[PDB]
């Protein structure tokens, strides 16, 4: 019923206001609590901050000095702004709905209680990289095949992560296998996607490789044939 979807730049220069947004689909926004969470490589999960249903904010003292959380009730969009970003700020930033629970141990009249917050429905994550380097679109080359066989799609020399890959504009879904990237010493990732299809389908089921790299708005296509 309620799902969340993040959206970000993908690349932000050092010492610059990073900005993210997150869309709620199904429920409203001004009647729940929401949390921003980022996860760096190696370091564990980190709670950035949260915003109430009454649009009140509270920041982790870790990054309290430079994080601003917002909300737009016109639709279901809440944003996040973090300035003075460094290299250690690149991470997957998640978006989730915080639920307020009241733990009562003593008497509520004496205030012997405390509030805890927990995220029950999360987004999917938006990859954000902090680097002085400039963006670059990929270069998609076909990989022709030869009980069954397999064909590929070589997505090389792009920056930064990620790159979505679909076959036949989303039609071909069975037997698809997209492989993690490779950071070459030149500083660019290189991906590869391959599907395993029946041998007889070579003539002539058209196999269209779809590749998208949003940080450079450089979508491309390419067919494969012996």
């Amino acid at each position: 019923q309620v799902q969340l979807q993040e959206s970000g730049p993908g690349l932000v220069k050092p010492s610059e206001t990073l900005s993210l947004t997150c869309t709620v689909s199904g429920g409203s926004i001004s009647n729940y609590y929401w949390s921003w969470i980022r996860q760096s490589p190696g370091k564990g999960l980190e709670w950035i901050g949260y915003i109430s249903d009454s649009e009140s904010t509270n920041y982790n003292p870790s990054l309290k000095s430079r994080v601003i959380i917002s909300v737009d009730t016109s639709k279901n969009q809440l944003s996040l702004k973090l300035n003075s970003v460094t290299a250690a700020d690149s991470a997957i930033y998640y978006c989730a709905r915080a639920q307020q629970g009241k733990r009562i141990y003593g008497m509520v009249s004496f205030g012997e209680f405390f509030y805890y917050y927990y995220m029950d429905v999360w987004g999917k994550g938006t990859t954000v990289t902090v680097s002085s380097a400039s963006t670059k679109g990929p270069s998609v080359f076909p990989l022709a095949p030869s009980g069954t066989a397999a064909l590929g799609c070589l997505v090389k020399d792009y920056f930064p992560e990620p790159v979505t890959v679909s076959w036949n504009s989303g039609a071909l879904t069975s037997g698809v296998h997209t492989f993690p990237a490779v950071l070459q010493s030149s500083g660019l990732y290189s991906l590869s996607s391959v599907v395993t299809v029946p041998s007889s389908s070579l003539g002539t089921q058209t196999y269209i490789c779809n590749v998208n790299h949003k940080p450079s708005n450089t979508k491309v296509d390419k067919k494969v044939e012996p």
Partner: protein, 211 residues
């Protein structure tokens, strides 16, 4: 933050004790996080678990003080390999900002799986661009630990190879890629090129040649 490991045999029950112990009445959350993916809130109150989560995931309630918070995973499967976090709240301490440490559960006793190596020669369009790259795709193996080796004809080749560390597939196996980069003349001036993939005690080979 730091990570503490834990190995549970396949099918057993897992006992994951919490990192920090509570000084008073507690309210603990349990999240399942596999890196590169959205965390999954397993148990939100001391024992209340949301829908879409099996009964095998259980937590200890706060009946009498002294009981430690332990997440209990009965009947462990290969899918249970993830990081488990203990979001600890209590009446004594302050606001629980840090999610705490991380327990890396690795389920032992999973079946040994052999790779599915697939090698692709340089494309015609790539060779037209005066660049030539071999790709060696490895998939459907367990345990996720392999070794690649590139040979120009018979002699080895190590200058210009890049390899991915294994990554878990959706079917609980692993996969990795190996990219050999060479000038298009080196692709033509040699007879064949091979990608030897050694996994566990065995080595598989797949080769390709410009024909």
């Amino acid at each position: 933050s730091y990570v503490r490991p834990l190995s549970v045999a396949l099918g057993e029950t897992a006992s994951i004790s919490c990192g920090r112990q509570a000084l008073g009445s507690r309210a603990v959350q349990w999240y399942q996080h596999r890196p590169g993916q959205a965390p999954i809130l397993l148990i939100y109150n001391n024992q209340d678990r949301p829908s879409g989560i099996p009964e095998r995931f259980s937590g200890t309630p706060d009946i009498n003080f002294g009981t430690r918070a332990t997440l209990t995973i009965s009947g462990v499967e290969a899918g249970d390999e993830a990081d488990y976090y203990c979001h600890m709240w209590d009446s004594r301490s302050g606001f629980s900002w840090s999610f705490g440490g991380a327990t890396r559960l690795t389920v032992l006793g999973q079946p040994k799986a052999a790779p599915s190596v697939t090698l692709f020669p340089p494309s015609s369009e790539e060779l037209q661009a005066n660049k030539a790259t071999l790709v060696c795709l490895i998939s459907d193996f367990y345990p996720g630990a392999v070794t690649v080796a590139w040979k120009a004809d018979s002699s080895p080749v190590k200058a210009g190879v890049e390899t991915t560390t294994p990554s878990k597939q959706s079917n609980n196996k692993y996969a990795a890629s190996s990219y050999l980069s060479l000038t298009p003349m080196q692709w033509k001036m040699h007879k064949s090129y091979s990608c030897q993939v050694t996994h566990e005690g065995s080595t598989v080979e797949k080769t390709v040649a410009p024909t």
